[PDB]
From a paper:
Initiation of DNA synthesis during DNA replication relies on a specialised DNA-dependent RNA polymerase, known as primase. In archaea and eukarya, primase is a constitutive heterodimer of a catalytic subunit, [name] or Pri1, and a regulatory subunit, [name] or Pri27. PriX is required for primase activity and the protein is encoded by a gene that is essential for viability. We have shown that PriX has replaced the Fe–S cluster domain of [name] as the primase module responsible for endowing primase with the ability to initiate nucleic acid synthesis.
To test this hypothesis, we designed and prepared a heterodimeric version of the [name] primase (named Chimera), which contained wild-type [name] and a second subunit where amino acids 1 to 211 of [name] were fused to amino acids 42 to 154 of PriX, thus excluding the [name]-CTD. Strikingly, Chimera was fully active in primer synthesis assays on both poly(dT) and mixed-sequence DNA templates, in support of the hypothesis that PriX had replaced [name]-CTD as the functional module that cooperates with [name] in [name] primase. The experiments showed that Chimera was able to prime levels of DNA synthesis that were comparable to those of wild-type [name], thus confirming the results of the primase assay. Interestingly, the crystal structure of Chimera shows that covalently-linked PriX occupies a similar but not identical position relative to PriX in the [name] structure, possibly representing an intermediate point in a putative PriX trajectory between initiation and extension states. The cross-linking experiment was performed for both [name] and Chimera, yielding equivalent results, in further support of Chimera’s recapitulation of the behavior of wild-type [name]. Primer initiation assay showed no primer synthesis by the cross-linked Chimera, in support of the view that the [name] conformation, as seen in the crystal structure, is not compatible with primer initiation. However, RNA primer extension assays using either NTP or dNTP did show primer elongation, indicating that the crystal structure of [name] represents a biochemically active and potentially physiologically relevant conformation. The fact that the cross-linked Chimera was exclusively active in the extension, but not initiation, of an RNA primer, points to the conformation of the crystal structure as representing a ‘polymerase’ mode. Our evidence of a functional replacement of [name]-CTD by PriX indicates that neither the presence of a Fe–S cluster nor, therefore, its putative redox activity are required for primer synthesis in the archaeal primase of [name].
Residue numbers in the entry:
A (entry chain A): 11 to 329
B (entry chain B): 3 to 208
C (entry chain C): 56 to 154
C-alpha cells in the first residue's frame, strides 16, 4: 500500500480546483502514480466529473489542462480537435537562475554515486536538488518584471501562480484576437520580454515608455523558458492541484510581496515517521534540517512528504 | 489628396461614370489602341528592373492603373504579379515621402490600417544623436499582422510599446503603407479570373 | 503544365518527402499556384503525414516557404528529376503509375 497515494487521494476528495469557465472545451491530461506515460485526451464537463475520475479512476501525480480550447477535446487526430484559440503563457525556470546544490547517491549504501546504478547494490541511483528560498527570491524578481511588461507595454491582465516546485507561472486569459496568435507571433512577444532584439537605449529617461525607460532603470531582459510561450498547444498545470516532485499546492499569488516559501504551501497536516537516505544539512521549505542516514525522525507531514518526493528518503508511517 | 498620384482612390466602376453609363472597361480596351500599350509599358519595365513612372505622367491615370491589373490577371504569372506589387508600391514610396501627415492617415484608413494619432512621445538616443518623436500609434496585434512579411528591423523588440500600442513615426507609417499596397495588389488580382473577357481582347494582351 | 505535382500531394510519398517539398512541392504552391503563405503550410504538412513514419516540424516548413518566396524559384521538371535525384523519380513514377 503506497502511503503517498493516500495523502494525494485524501486531498483531491475535499480540495476544490481552480478550473476555467470553458471547462468542457479543454483537453485534460495527467501522470498517474508509478508510471511515466501521460494519459491525455480526457474531456470533463464539470468539477464533479473530474473529482470522480481522479479519486476512483486514475489518481494524478501531476495534473494538467490544455491552454488551447478545442471543440472536440478528446480527439487524437490533430485537425479533428478543432483548434479555436489558446491562452498566452509564460514559465520562469530556476535552471538558468540560481543553480542549486545537487547530490546523487545510492538509496542502499548511501555513498555518492555519479553513474546510473551503484556498483555494489545494483540499484537505481537517486538525485536530490536543494530548492532554497533564496532561489525563490531571485525567481520572484523575474515575475515582477514580467508582470510589469505585460501590464505597461501590452495592456494585458496577467495572473501569477506558484509552479509547485521551482519557479512561477504567468498566465493571460484571452478570448479575442490575443488567443489566435501564431507560433511565430508569440515568439516576437517572447523575445521582446527576454530583451533579445531590444537594443540598449543608453541615454534614455527612467520615465520613458517601453524598454527605453526600463533599460535605464537597470532592468535587463526577463529569464523565461521561451519554449512555453512559443508552443500554441500547452498543458497548464491545474491551480490548487498538487505537484508530483514536492506535493505543494499550485497556489495563485494575488500579491507578490507577501509570498513566503514555507510549509503553508503543503496541505498535509499531522506527523510522519521519515527514514532518510543520506546524512545532509540542507535547507527545506525555508528552514535548515539535519537528517541522519537510517535513523528515523518524526517531522510534520508537510515537510515529510516534501522530502519523500525529492528522493531524500521514505515516509514509513502517519501519526 | 490628388487622384492623379493615387489612382486607387477612384474605383474602376466610378471613373467609368464620366462616359455616360454602361461603358465598361472592356468597351474602352477594345477600341483604345494605346491603353493596352501603356499597361504593357509598365509590365515590361518591371521585368527589366527599371523604375515605374509616376501616374501623373498619363492622361488617364485611373484607367492605366486598372488596365495594368487586368493585363496581369490575364498573364497569370504569379512570379510577375508578385514582382509588380513590389515595384508598384515602391513607386508610391517616393510619392509618400513628400506627403503631409493628414493625407498619410487618409490613405491608411482606405487601406483598413488601424492607425491614429496620439500625444507625441519624445526620447533621446545615443546612436542617432537626435531627438526621436513618435506620433502615430498602432495596436501590437495589428502591428504583428502588418509586419508579417517584413525585415528584422520591424521586430517587436526594436519598438516602443505602451499599453498595447506600438508607436510609429513618419518613415514607419510610410513603411507600413508600402507593405499594404503590395498586399492589396496581390489580393486585387485573385478574384479577377471571374469575368469571361471576349476572347479577342485576351489575344490583344498576348 | 504541372498536373503531376497535385497528384503526388493528393496521394503521398515514402522515402524522399523532404526533397520533394524543397525542390518541387513548395515552389509550385507558392510560385505557380499562388496560395496563401499559411495555406501552403497546411497543404504541405498534410502531405508529409501519409505514411506517417516520420515527423516534420512547422519550423522547417515555414523556412522553405519563405525561402522560395524571396528567391523566386520554380518547381523542377520531371526531366530534371531524372538528371539529379534518380531515387526521387522512381518514387514519383510509382505514384504516377498508380493511376
Ligand atoms: Zn549502493
Amino acid at each position: 500500500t503506497n502511503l503517498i497515494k493516500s495523502f494525494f487521494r485524501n486531498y483531491y476528495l475535499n480540495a476544490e480546483l481552480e478550473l476555467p469557465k470553458d471547462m468542457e472545451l479543454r483537453e485534460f491530461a495527467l501522470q498517474p502514480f508509478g508510471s511515466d506515460t501521460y494519459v491525455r485526451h480526457l474531456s470533463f464537463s464539470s468539477s464533479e466529473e473530474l473529482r470522480d475520475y481522479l479519486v476512483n479512476r486514475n489518481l494524478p501525480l501531476h495534473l494538467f489542462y490544455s491552454s488551447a480550447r478545442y471543440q472536440l477535446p478528446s480527439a487524437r487526430n490533430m485537425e479533428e480537435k478543432a483548434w479555436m484559440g489558446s491562452d498566452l503563457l509564460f514559465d520562469i525556470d530556476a535552471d538558468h537562475l540560481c543553480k542549486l546544490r545537487s547530490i546523487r547517491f545510492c538509496p542502499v549504501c548511501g555513498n555518492a554515486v555519479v553513474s546510473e546504478k551503484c556498483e555494489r547494490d545494483n540499484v537505481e541511483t537517486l538525485e536530490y536538488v536543494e530548492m532554497t528560498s533564496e532561489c525563490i527570491k531571485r525567481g520572484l524578481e523575474q515575475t515582477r518584471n514580467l508582470v510589469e511588461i505585460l501590464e505597461d507595454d501590452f495592456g494585458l491582465k496577467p495572473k501569477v501562480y506558484f509552479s509547485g516546485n521551482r519557479g512561477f507561472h504567468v498566465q493571460v486569459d484571452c478570448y479575442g484576437n490575443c488567443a489566435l496568435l501564431d507560433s511565430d507571433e508569440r515568439k516576437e512577444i517572447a523575445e521582446y520580454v527576454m530583451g533579445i532584439g531590444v537594443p540598449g537605449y543608453p541615454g534614455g529617461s527612467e520615465n520613458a515608455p517601453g524598454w527605453v525607460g526600463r533599460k535605464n532603470r537597470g532592468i535587463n531582459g526577463v529569464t523565461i523558458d521561451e519554449q512555453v510561450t512559443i508552443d500554441v498547444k500547452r498543458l497548464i498545470r491545474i491551480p490548487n492541484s498538487l505537484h508530483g516532485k514536492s506535493g505543494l499546492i499550485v497556489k495563485r499569488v494575488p500579491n507578490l510581496d507577501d509570498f513566503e516559501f514555507n510549509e503553508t504551501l503543503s496541505p498535509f497536516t499531522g506527523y510522519t515517521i521519515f527514514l532518510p537516505y543520506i546524512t545532509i544539512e540542507t535547507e527545506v521549505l525555508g528552514s535548515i534540517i539535519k537528517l541522519n542516514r537510517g535513523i528515523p525522525i518524526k517531522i510534520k507531514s508537510s515537510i515529510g512528504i516534501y522530502l519523500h518526493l525529492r528522493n531524500l528518503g521514505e515516509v514509513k508511517a502517519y501519526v | 489628396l490628388d487622384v492623379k498620384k493615387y489612382p486607387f482612390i477612384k474605383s474602376l466602376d466610378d471613373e467609368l461614370k464620366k462616359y455616360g453609363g454602361g461603358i465598361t472597361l472592356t468597351d474602352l480596351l477594345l477600341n483604345s489602341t494605346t491603353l493596352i500599350d501603356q499597361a504593357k509599358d509598365r509590365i515590361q519595365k518591371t521585368k527589366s528592373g527599371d523604375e515605374l513612372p509616376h501616374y501623373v505622367s498619363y492622361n488617364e491615370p485611373v484607367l492605366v492603373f486598372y488596365t495594368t491589373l487586368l493585363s496581369l490577371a490575364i498573364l497569370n504569372d504569379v512570379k510577375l504579379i508578385r514582382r509588380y506589387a513590389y515595384a508598384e508600391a515602391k513607386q508610391f514610396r517616393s510619392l509618400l515621402h513628400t506627403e503631409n501627415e493628414e493625407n498619410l492617415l487618409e490613405i491608411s484608413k482606405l487601406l483598413d490600417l488601424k492607425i491614429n494619432r496620439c500625444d507625441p512621445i519624445k526620447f533621446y538616443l545615443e546612436k542617432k544623436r537626435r531627438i526621436i518623436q513618435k506620433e502615430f500609434c498602432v495596436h501590437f496585434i495589428d502591428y504583428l499582422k502588418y509586419t508579417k512579411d517584413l525585415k528584422e528591423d520591424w521586430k517587436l523588440s526594436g519598438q516602443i510599446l505602451h499599453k498595447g500600442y506600438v508607436y510609429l513615426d513618419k518613415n514607419q507609417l510610410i513603411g507600413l503603407i508600402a507593405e499594404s499596397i503590395k498586399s492589396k495588389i496581390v489580393e486585387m488580382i485573385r478574384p479577377l479570373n471571374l469575368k469571361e473577357i471576349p476572347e479577342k481582347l485576351k489575344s490583344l494582351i498576348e
